[PDB]
Amino acid sequence: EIFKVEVKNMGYFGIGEFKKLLRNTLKFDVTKIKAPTRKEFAFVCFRSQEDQQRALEILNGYKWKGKVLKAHVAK
């Protein structure tokens, strides 16, 4: 089943940097990322609901690449 979020207020970023944050720094089990413009927003899907819930708790308020990130569930 699908456990998706949208990360917002990202400013400019690289996909390598973002996948590092999610998978190396925060140890999320990421199944998929759609951030095609490399700015402002990224959709992410996690293998478990636990990581989706974890991503929303952590990323809301998380200072990264000069920005205070926000995140919400995505359908």
Ligand SMILES: [Cl-]
């Ligand atoms: Cl920026």
Ligand SMILES: [Cl-]
């Ligand atoms: Cl932004």
Ligand SMILES: [Cl-]
């Ligand atoms: Cl960029």
Ligand SMILES: [Cl-]
């Ligand atoms: Cl990068």
Ligand SMILES: [Cl-]
């Ligand atoms: Cl990039």
Ligand SMILES: [Cl-]
């Ligand atoms: Cl990096």
Ligand SMILES: [Cl-]
């Ligand atoms: Cl990081």
Ligand SMILES: [Cl-]
């Ligand atoms: Cl985690």
Ligand SMILES: [Cl-]
């Ligand atoms: Cl992907």
Ligand SMILES: [Cl-]
């Ligand atoms: Cl799409």
Ligand SMILES: [Cl-]
């Ligand atoms: Cl992408």
Ligand SMILES: [Cl-]
């Ligand atoms: Cl592209």
Ligand SMILES: [Cl-]
């Ligand atoms: Cl689950």
Ligand SMILES: [Cl-]
């Ligand atoms: Cl988890």
Ligand SMILES: [Cl-]
């Ligand atoms: Cl919050």
Ligand SMILES: [Cl-]
């Ligand atoms: Cl924080």
